[PDB]
Amino acid sequence: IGGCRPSAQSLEIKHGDLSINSANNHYAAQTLSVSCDVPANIRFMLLRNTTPTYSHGKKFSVGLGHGWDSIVSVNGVDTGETTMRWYKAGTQNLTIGSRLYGESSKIQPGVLSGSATLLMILP
């Protein structure tokens, strides 16, 4: 009978104006709201579309182009996944964070663009 409902707004993490000098280590976040009519449990997993230019160990990341990467996080986790629980009906928030560059930044700046998939596995 249908379940939790995430907000419909487009999810775009905007870093805005960025200078080739001061572009790395920038940070920007987006907040996705989720309303459930019954107590619930949802597992969120990040999946990469754009391939990372650099290596980041265990941290999840995507490619923003022109020699630039981004470490994406959910609810403050860089690991790549997190679970949210509703002990009762209501709205809970999931925050997505984005930190730039990493490793050997021998960039070639010029308008960054990238993307990742936020998967919700329902029990």
Partner 1 sequence: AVSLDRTRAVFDGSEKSMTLDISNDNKQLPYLAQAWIENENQEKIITGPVIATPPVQRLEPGAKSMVRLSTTPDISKLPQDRESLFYFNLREIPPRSEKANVLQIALQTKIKLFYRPAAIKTRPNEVWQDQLILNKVSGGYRIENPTPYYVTVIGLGGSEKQAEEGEFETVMLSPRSEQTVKSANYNTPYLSYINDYGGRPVLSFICNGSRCSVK
Binding status of residue 96 toward partner 1 by CB under 8 A:
yes
Q: What CA–CA distance (Å, rounded) separates 33 from 98?
A: 18
* Number of residues near partner 1 (by CB under 8 A): 44
C-alpha 115/C-alpha 36 separation (Å) is 27
- The upper half-sphere exposure of residue 98, i.e. CA atoms within 13 Å in the direction of its Cβ, equals 23
Pattern 41-80, binding to partner 1, x per CB under 8 A? Answer: x-----x-x------------x-x-----x-x--------
- The answer to whether 123 contacts partner 1 (rule: CB under 8 A) is yes
38-66 burial, b at 16+ Cβ within 10 Å, e below that, comes to eebebebebebebebbeeeeebbbbbbbe
Name the residue nearer to partner 1 (CB basis): 103 or 121: 121
C-alpha to C-alpha distance for 82 and 44, rounded to whole angstroms? 5
What span, in angstroms and rounded, lies between the C-alpha atoms of 58 and 101? 15
Nearer to partner 1, 35 or 104 (CB): 35
Q: Is 92 near partner 1 (CB under 8 A)?
A: no
Minimal distance, residue 97 CB to partner 1, in Å: 10
| Nearest residue (CB) to partner 1, 55 versus 113 | 113
Task: Tell me the C-alpha distance between 78 and 24, whole Å.
Answer: 17
* Contact set with partner 1 (CB under 8 A): 1-3, 5-6, 8-18, 28, 30, 32, 38-39, 41, 47, 49, 62, 64, 70, 72, 87, 96, 98, 111-123
